[PDB]
């Protein structure tokens, strides 16, 4: 071991902050998760693993709604993600919706979140988050989007990608079967066949949590009368909608 990897404030002789990479290790360990950008949609999915079937997994989400046009998932330290989430849904109001009378575009939320991710770094006395998220959404002027966010605070945009244990290859599979055209149903497909090899458990409707960004749901509002207020694009598929698409391979 070095003598430089135990301080966020410390540069190794080459120029690599340390604690960050080990934090980034807890991520390269977490359960496999992916995201695919379509042409008329975007899909984000991640697997589920049960400590024991005595536990109700249907009371702990892994694909979360930040804004009714953006959802996100992760791979790494469970607990971080849970609150990193609620802090994201707020920095989304106090920092945009409450100043501009509207919700934020994809790009800026991801950056408002990487901003909170940044703090964890620059400062001894705290540890960075052991999580890496894939945030997917869509806003009028930018079409659909796909982004990754690491403890290092940096963030990038993909067309498709995966993070987690079974990523080296899953990220290899996708590379092969992706092209600018895939409609959403195709993506939803290509995803399962990739969330396929990346498992040792099973493939039911519970151990799989997948949601997607697509068309507006004039049903999922709760009211009707205002023309422009049309609906949320984020849809977390239900246990059922799933296994049906599993039968048709």
């Amino acid at each position: 071991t070095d003598r430089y990897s135990f301080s966020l404030t410390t540069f190794s002789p080459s120029g690599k902050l340390g604690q960050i990479d080990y934090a980034l290790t807890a991520v390269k360990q977490g359960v496999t998760s992916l995201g695919i950008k379509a042409t008329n949609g975007v899909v984000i999915a991640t697997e589920k693993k049960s400590s024991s079937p005595l536990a109700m997994s249907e009371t702990l989400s892994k694909v979360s709604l930040l804004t009714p046009d953006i959802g996100a998932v992760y791979s790494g330290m469970g607990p971080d993600y849970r609150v990193l989430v609620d802090k994201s849904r707020k920095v989304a109001h106090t920092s945009y919706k409450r100043i501009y009378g509207e919700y934020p575009p994809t790009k800026l939320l991801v950056s408002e979140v990487a901003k909170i991710m940044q703090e964890a770094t620059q400062s001894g006395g705290v540890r960075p988050f052991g999580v890496s998220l894939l945030i997917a959404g869509h806003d009028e002027f930018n079409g659909f989007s796909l982004y990754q966010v690491d403890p290092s605070g940096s963030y990038f945009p993909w067309k498709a990608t995966a993070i987690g244990k079974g990523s080296v290859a899953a990220k290899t599979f996708l590379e092969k079967r992706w092209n600018d055209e895939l409609e959403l149903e195709d993506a939803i497909h290509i995803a399962l066949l990739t969330l396929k090899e990346s498992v040792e458990g099973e493939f039911n409707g519970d151990t799989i949590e997948l949601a997607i960004i697509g068309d507006e749901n004039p049903d999922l509002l709760g009211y009707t009368g205002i023309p422009t207020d049309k609906g949320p694009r984020f849809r977390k598929l239900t246990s059922q909608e799933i296994n049906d698409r599993l039968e048709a391979l």
């Binding site: 071991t1 003598r3 002789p13 690599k16 902050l17 990479d21 980034l24 290092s152 940096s154």
Partner: protein
């Protein structure tokens, strides 16, 4: 530096992971059964000498059965030491740029390298000129040499001088103990092969486990990944 890159490349292509893995498989089946074989070969050979009575007759010839074991043993050590040097050559050429950071894998490399050298020391044996740890190592792979040299010295004492096998002008010493010692030198060197091989089993089984677990880190000591910088 396009040529310097070449040299290092050809080096690691000559000794791939496949080369060393083959060595482990051999040790898993073939080489281990052989050692267990040499084990009882000298085990029963030690039982024979225990139920024999030594006379002047046995000082006039070297027991060919024993020379058959110490030889069969020296042969096995020879092979192992070479098969080890193979595994070592596979790692030594994959030790990265000397740094003061990111040596988590390097540590694993040096660790395994040490256990391997500990193995090579056993097989190579003690010798006759010595390493600060002494000769707590059973018997070297030069058993044949040491054996003949030990027995030879006693065959001259028991065994007289001017003359020729019989009753003669040419006698020897009467020490009843010196005769029993010729009997023990045959018994001991047979026991030393039992032990040397029992321990050698353990050592080999260990290295196999140690290799099969850390092999990934042995080939890839460092995993480059600059996701932060850009």
């Amino acid at each position: 530096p396009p040529k310097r890159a070449a040299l290092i490349q050809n080096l690691r292509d000559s000794y791939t992971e496949t080369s060393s893995f083959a060595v482990i498989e051999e040790w898993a089946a073939g080489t281990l059964q052989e050692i267990e074989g040499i084990a009882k070969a000298a085990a029963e050979a030690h039982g024979v000498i225990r139920n024999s009575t030594y006379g002047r007759a046995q000082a006039e010839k070297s027991p060919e059965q024993l020379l058959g074991v110490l030889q069969r043993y020296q042969d096995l050590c020879h092979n192992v030491y070479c098969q080890a040097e193979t595994i070592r050559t596979v790692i030594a050429i994959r030790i990265p740029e000397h740094k003061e950071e990111d040596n988590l894998g390097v540590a694993v490399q040096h660790a395994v390298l040490k256990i391997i050298d500990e193995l090579e020391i056993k097989t190579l044996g003690s010798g006759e000129k010595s390493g600060s740890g002494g000769a707590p190592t059973p018997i070297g792979m030069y058993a044949l040499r040491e054996y003949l040299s030990a027995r030879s010295t006693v065959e001259d004492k028991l065994l007289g001088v001017d003359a020729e096998s019989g009753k003669t002008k040419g006698g020897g010493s009467q020490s009843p103990s010196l005769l029993l010692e010729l009997r023990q030198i045959d018994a001991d060197f047979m026991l030393k092969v039992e032990l040397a091989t029992t321990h050698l089993s353990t050592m080999v089984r260990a290295v196999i486990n140690a290799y099969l677990l850390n092999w990934k880190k042995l080939i890839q000591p460092r995993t480059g990944s600059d996701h932060m910088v850009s």
